[PDB]
């Protein structure tokens, strides 16, 4: 049931399925199935043309999803990065940004360990 900018959830419950949409997840799932009054447990394949239409309508108009959403974040980071901003540098140098200790566990933001001679 291609909803948000070319989505495709199927064979699984709609809520769980709606998730596969970028800007969507658990929370916003209920909201859409709640307001759009569709049973959350129906298989996307068991949906009604009348419901899919409705769903898409709410979801696509109410929240910034997929591609567009990314564009925003991208530009958001490039922003505090274009400006002197400290967080900018961190995004630049590549080290964490939410004031965490880098002497150790910072692998997720740093990547594989580039071991050097001691």
């Amino acid at each position: 049931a291609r909803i948000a900018g070319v989505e495709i959830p199927r064979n699984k419950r709609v809520d769980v399925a709606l998730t596969y949409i970028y800007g969507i997840g658990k929370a916003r799932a209920k909201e859409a199935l709640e307001k759009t009054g569709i049973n959350p447990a129906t298989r996307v394949k068991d949906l009604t043309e009348a419901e899919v239409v409705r769903l898409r309508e709410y979801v696509e108009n109410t929240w910034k999803l997929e591609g567009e959403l990314r564009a925003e974040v991208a530009a958001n980071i490039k922003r505090l990065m274009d400006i002197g901003c400290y967080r900018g540098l961190r995004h630049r140098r590549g080290l964490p940004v939410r004031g965490q200790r880098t002497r150790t566990n910072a692998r997720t933001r740093k990547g594989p360990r580039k071991t050097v001679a001691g």
Binding site: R79, L80, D82, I83, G84, C85, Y86, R87, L89
Partner: protein, 80 residues
Amino acid sequence: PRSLKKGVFVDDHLLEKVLELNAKGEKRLIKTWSRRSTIVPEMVGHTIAVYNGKQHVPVYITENMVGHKLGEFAPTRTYR
């Protein structure tokens, strides 16, 4: 995911000093030690020298940085 409830913060000596320059039109170069102050449109166009703990750095303020605090533009440490 920032914070500061209701009532932005800016140190007096810096604030009631910046706007004091607007009255006289415009000034050239300032310098505070309170990097704790929030930036505000009142500053747009000015140049505040923020102390990092060792020096006073010229920090040209712009509309795009109106929310950040001076310190964010005066990096504390020196690395590689």
